[PDB]
Design a protein around this ligand. Structure first.
Ligand SMILES: CN[C@@H]1[C@@H](O)[C@@H](O[C@@H]2[C@@H](O)[C@H](O[C@H]3O[C@H]([C@@H](C)O)[C@@H](O)[C@H](O)[C@H]3N)[C@@H](N)C[C@H]2N)OC[C@]1(C)O
Lengths: 189, 171, 194, 130, 106, 199
RNA sequence: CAUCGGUUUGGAGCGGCAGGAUAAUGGCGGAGGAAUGUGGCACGGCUUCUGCUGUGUGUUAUAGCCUCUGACGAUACUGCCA
RNA sequence: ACCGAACGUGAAGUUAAAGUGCCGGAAUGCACGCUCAUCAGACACCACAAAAGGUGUUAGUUCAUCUAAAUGAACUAGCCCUGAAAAUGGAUGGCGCUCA
RNA sequence: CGAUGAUUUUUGCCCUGCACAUUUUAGAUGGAUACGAAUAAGACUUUUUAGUCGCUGGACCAUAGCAGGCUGGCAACGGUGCGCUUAGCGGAAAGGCUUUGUGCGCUUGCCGGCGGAUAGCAAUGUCAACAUGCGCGGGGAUAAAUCCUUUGCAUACGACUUAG
């Protein structure tokens, strides 16, 4: 409808410094550094003070304005991943065949190896994204821990694990086997 | 420049029974006086049972804007015909003259409703004196405190086909 | 109307036109992809088809009915006397494809490979490569500069080799000359090896 | 610190000085909508104009109320010395220099050529001694 | 000096034409530096020479000339209509012509 | 708007059809045109859509003999050439002469690497398209339909840009030196007299 | 090349006159009003009030605006100039 | 066979219908909006599309709950999307065009 | 489209200097004047706070002299044209961008002396790049292909693979 101005406020906490130039966003915190490129969006940024940043769209229509909240949420995930971390938990679900999951290394590169899924002889390997750590949890039986600074990478790599274990040619309501994301939270609470 | 506002005054031709027929006035938005009188007769023939042949135009006069350099918000009430029926609607415009707002309304109903000039009756054009009389947000957002806004992505219009310097859009 | 019954096409559309080949020597359309870490080595060789014979062999394929049993197989014999390296060609990458920059030849060429540059050898003065051999005599600095060019600019290096057809029972005296791409190492290693 | 780089856009707002027809100055008095404003100045006619027909300048008339009439705008304009601020800007100097150049006769252009010859002689002498 | 030009550069663009029929008697000429009908009106009535080279010498010269004159403007982009003593041959579409400064009114 | 001996256009960021129409009219009027960096040309619309359009183009071929059919060139400069030829009466001798005045290239080959390149504002994408619209880079489209030399052109363009940056650094150093020399000889009698004349 | 006659296309053309709400405006003088409320004052989060700042009250004050009107003076628009 | 206009042989001027990004003479002319389509659309006769759907977007109508900071329901009609399947490769005339 | 070998003992061929004369031209008539990238961005200075620039190339460079003659002085020791020389860089289609000394010229940076008429009041009023040929001059090199006979890895005939 061509709204004259739309604003969003980024709350940037005590231990972070969000550096922005030409829609390239670099968020430094106690757990490291995260970068995001936003050259595909027409937005502008204002430093209100050290603890707040204003994000603005001028003369935007409905969809251009819809992108504004998305921009703010993405940068906020950057901040909360550089200060609090991100941790996704996966549980192994099976009826008869135990799912054997190991973190192996080939070509000097880390992989997640899933064996005996529904008794299949095929072995499944999922490449581990950069900055994402996998860890077989010890407190809980049959649980995988996916952690990292980037919410996007951690969630995508957990989804890669969940999608590789789809059941074919069966009633999935009955054959409920798989590896599913059970908890989505933060490393430090 | 497309339109002017006219008053058109007319009556029935005097007869022995009615020597002093009533005078009727209309406010007509027209390109010229020929169209103005035509619109007057069109509306008088729809409202009252009077034809052009038994009446006469008494007066045609330009009505100029009182304050042509004062920014105003206008409310306009309309009856228009769509492809499928007849509808009433009310819209708001910002301009410095009534004729400017009416020209914008004609463009706007052409653009959004495919409503040609022949399909629109202007019920009433009113200058909205108070900010509370302004109802539509697409005009209400220009009535706020300390209004300011940039004009990003300026495209400069060149007089030559080939430019020896890289394009810029700053402003 | 449709064919009354379905049948596959006769013959392959991928070997068209069914014309005579432009040359009798089959040319290598594509060479193996170059791996830098490997040792410098040739990728092709030229020989002569001599005939076919029969062999007997023990088969090693577990799960086959003929596992650890003798099979009789047809085989082909290719007469392959050694080839002689007589030159080197450097190729540069261009937006229009590979382009040969320069070619450097050896000082001495045998009669059989120099017979390749003639249609009437016995009526000729045999002048082929007679002024080129002088480019070595003084100090071979022109040869060194051309090879330095190949090292500086070429991305693909191929060697020029010819067969020794006089070691075959063939009555033909012309040797077959071909380019064989050099794979492995750097371009400098390739030029040195050539 | 966070160090974000902000835009340096010129804003459409009351008091912003504009050029009209590349020749004459004016100031924004009111905003009509996204496309149109009311402008006024001592050397123009108060009018409603499209923003696309005028060019914003980096100069803002300070403390000009919205909807000011012609007398108010002229008084504020004279008090703020907007003409002086504009005439000192390199933009106005370039316009004035182009106008000056376009008035030269053939004989004056000849004089420019000979003066530039002398100028170049001096500049090259300076260049070698550098 | 290095330059000796006393004419304005031009090009033979086209004939007067509709979509399908051409009129060789009128040539459309593009004057260099002229981009509006306002600026083109300076050149109305000025003489135009098309100068070309021919194989056979006439009075010892191989250079031949076809003379014309600017008659009116054409369109909105500063082109002009020209009238030559002999119609310019169509092979000269895209060739250079010379717009003289005379008859002068400066 | 002057008549030039050659006009060399940097094709980067230009919209295909608008540049094509401008260049067609230029060459038809006797102007020689060179367009470089055709791999950097733009087409409006998302990449997938223009890929579908090129595949619709590919589908057209002479049924009785494919070798007589339309020939689908994949290189970006040939895509621009196809756009330009469709705007030329190319079956006339005058049209062939006009097309002989045009040259199109991937990258910036010599001798045009050391010549001035210009832009065409009426065809420039950043000036023409509304800011939110999607567009295609012709180099990416060409690779997706069979152009084989994207990486070669990219490498050679990197090398050219290194050399050009060195050139520009030297030019900038000399320009600064000359500017200092001009400022030193300022407040001179000739300089003041020139300033009175607008120069 | 000059001047004339016939036809015709132009110029940032220049000037005189008439009409209209004897334009409407604007400018000046006077009366009345209000808020997207200026100064002032009272309360606040960030300011060593370093456009800081928001909410209130109220009516020209350390900015202004709107309506009506009184005497002048122009301009646009349309038309005429033998 | 429609629109315009009816015809001796010429010069100059002006037009009708139709047009002015290139092919093609004439503007990438000035302006307000709408539309983004993984079968967009593009001009009378004329070279077709329906019933019916969409929380794509836009503008409107009528009710309702709201400070005891806006929101909810039904609906109208613009463009867009679905409904929309044929045989040689191919047609807004072609190129191509997306604040067109 | 590229690389590479050999290119006539004929008075034929190649390279090169000059001079003269011809033919051709899709169309010279001061100069195609070289960063890259972004565009809701670039650059400069302090300092990341802010100030400034652009808002078109109507720019930059070149531009005075019988189409640019003949002569003389002053100021600076600069600018510039042609011919030699050194060194480096450039392979995307490099064939160009440079740099070192050297010889002869010009210099409008400033001031002088002489010359142009009559082409008659305009007439392109003839000044370019490309190529070729002809006289002289200086360097340099000294082939093959086809027919024919032969072969059969080929073949209707041409063609092809061979040998002489
Ligand atoms: C306003 N009246 C519209 C009329 O304009 C037209 O609408 C078309 C619509 O039918 C087209 O859409 C239709 O036709 C296209 C194709 C055949 O063009 C199909 O791809 C599409 O599936 C089909 N729904 C749509 N793409 C454009 C509208 N203007 O069709 C009739 C109508 C819907 O009444």
């Amino acid at each position: 409808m061509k709204y004259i101005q739309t604003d969003q406020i980024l709350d940037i906490p005590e231990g972070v410094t969000v550096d922005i130039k030409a829609r390239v966003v670099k968020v430094t915190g106690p757990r490291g550094e995260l970068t995001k490129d936003l050259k595909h969006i027409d937005v502008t940024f204002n430093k209100i003070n050290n603890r707040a940043i204003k994000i603005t769209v001028h003369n935007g229509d409905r969809k251009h304005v819809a992108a504004l909240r998305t921009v703010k949420s993405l940068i906020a995930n950057l901040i909360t991943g550089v200060t609090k971390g991100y941790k996704y938990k996966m549980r192994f679900v099976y009826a008869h065949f135990p799912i054997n999951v190991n973190i192996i290394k080939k070509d000097g590169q880390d992989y997640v190896e899933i064996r005996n899924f529904l008794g299949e002889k095929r072995v499944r390997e999922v490449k581990i994204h950069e900055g994402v750590t996998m860890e077989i949890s010890s407190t809980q039986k049959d649980e995988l821990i996916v952690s990292g600074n980037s919410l996007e990478a951690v969630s995508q790599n957990a989804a890669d694990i969940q999608q590789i274990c789809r059941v074919r040619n069966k009633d999935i309501r009955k054959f409920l086997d798989g590896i599913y994301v059970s908890e989505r939270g933060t490393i430090v609470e | 420049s497309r339109l002017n506002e006219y008053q058109v005054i007319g009556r029935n031709l005097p007869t022995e029974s009615v020597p002093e027929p009533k005078l009727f006035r209309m406010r007509i938005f027209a390109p010229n006086t020929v169209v103005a009188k035509s619109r007057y007769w069109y509306f008088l023939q729809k409202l009252h049972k009077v034809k052009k042949a038994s009446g006469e135009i008494v007066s045609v006069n330009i009505i100029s804007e009182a304050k042509p350099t004062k920014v105003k918000t206008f409310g306009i009430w309309l009856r228009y015909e769509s492809r499928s029926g007849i509808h009433n609607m009310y819209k708001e415009y910002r301009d410095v003259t009534r004729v400017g707002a009416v020209e914008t309304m004609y463009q706007d109903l052409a653009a959004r409703h495919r409503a040609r000039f022949r399909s629109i009756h202007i019920l009433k054009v009113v200058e909205l004196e108070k900010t509370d009389d302004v109802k539509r947000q697409y005009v209400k957002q220009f009535l706020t405190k300390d209004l300011k806004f940039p004009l990003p992505h300026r495209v400069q219009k060149s007089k030559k086909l080939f430019q020896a310097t890289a394009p810029t859009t700053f402003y | 109307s449709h064919r009354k019954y379905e049948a596959p096409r006769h013959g392959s559309l991928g070997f068209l036109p069914r014309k005579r080949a432009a040359k009798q020597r089959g040319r290598v359309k594509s060479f193996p992809k170059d791996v830098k870490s490997k040792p410098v080595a040739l990728t092709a060789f030229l020989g002569y088809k001599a005939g076919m014979t029969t062999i007997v062999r023990d088969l090693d394929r577990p799960g086959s009915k003929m596992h650890k049993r003798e099979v009789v197989e047809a085989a082909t014999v290719v007469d392959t006397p050694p080839m002689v390296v007589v030159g080197v060609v450097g190729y540069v990458e261009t937006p229009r494809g590979l382009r040969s920059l320069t070619t450097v030849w050896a000082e001495h060429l045998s009669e059989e490979v120099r017979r390749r540059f003639y249609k009437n050898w016995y009526k000729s003065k045999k002048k082929a490569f007679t002024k080129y051999s002088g480019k070595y005599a003084t100090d071979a600095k022109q040869v060194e500069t051309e090879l330095a060019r190949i090292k500086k600019y070429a991305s693909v290096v191929r060697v020029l080799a010819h067969t020794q057809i006089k070691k075959t029972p063939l009555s033909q005296k012309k040797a077959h000359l071909a380019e064989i791409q050099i794979n492995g190492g750097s371009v400098s290693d390739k030029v040195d090896w050539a | 610190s966070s160090t974000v780089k902000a835009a340096n856009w010129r804003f459409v707002e009351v008091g912003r000085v504009v050029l009209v027809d590349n020749k004459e100055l004016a100031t924004i008095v009111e905003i009509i909508d996204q496309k149109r404003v009311l402008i006024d100045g001592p050397k123009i006619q108060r009018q409603a104009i499209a923003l696309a027909k005028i060019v914003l300048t980096p100069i803002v008339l300070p403390n000009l109320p919205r909807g000011s009439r012609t007398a108010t705008v002229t008084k504020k304009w004279a008090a703020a010395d907007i003409d002086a601020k504009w005439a000192a800007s390199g933009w106005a100097k370039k316009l004035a220099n182009k106008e000056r150049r376009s008035q030269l006769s053939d004989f004056e252009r000849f004089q420019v050529m000979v003066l530039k010859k002398q100028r170049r002689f001096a500049t090259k002498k300076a260049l070698v001694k550098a | 000096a290095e330059s000796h030009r006393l004419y304005v550069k031009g090009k033979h663009i086209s004939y007067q034409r509709s979509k399908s029929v051409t009129n060789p008697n009128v040539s459309l000429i593009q004057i260099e530096g002229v981009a509006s009908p306002k600026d083109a009106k300076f050149y109305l009535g000025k003489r135009i020479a098309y100068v070309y080279r021919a194989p056979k010498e006439i009075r010892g010269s191989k250079i031949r000339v076809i003379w014309g004159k600017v008659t009116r403007t054409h369109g909105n982009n500063g082109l002009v209509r020209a009238n030559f003593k002999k119609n310019l041959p169509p092979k000269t579409f895209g060739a250079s012509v010379r717009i003289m400064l005379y008859p002068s009114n400066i | 708007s002057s008549f030039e001996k050659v006009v060399v256009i940097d094709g980067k960021g230009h919209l295909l059809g608008r540049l094509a129409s401008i260049v067609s009219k230029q060459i038809l009027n006797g102007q020689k045109v060179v367009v470089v960096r055709c791999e950097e040309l733009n087409i409006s619309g998302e990449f997938f859509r223009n890929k579908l359009k090129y595949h619709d183009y590919l589908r057209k071929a002479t049924r009785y003999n494919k070798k007589k059919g339309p020939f689908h060139f994949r290189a970006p400069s040939r895509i621009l050439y196809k756009a330009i030829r469709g705007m030329i009466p190319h079956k006339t001798a005058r049209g062939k002469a006009a097309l002989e005045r045009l040259k199109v290239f991937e990258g910036v080959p010599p001798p045009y690497d050391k010549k001035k390149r210009v832009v065409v504002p009426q065809a420039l994408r950043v000036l023409r398209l509304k800011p939110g619209r999607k567009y295609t880079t012709v180099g990416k489209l060409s690779s997706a339909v069979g152009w084989k030399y994207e990486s070669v052109v990219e490498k050679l363009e990197e090398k050219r840009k290194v050399q050009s940056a060195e050139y520009y650094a030297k030019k900038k150093a000399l320009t600064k030196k000359l500017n200092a020399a001009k400022a030193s000889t300022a407040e001179s009698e000739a300089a003041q007299k020139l300033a009175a004349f607008g120069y």
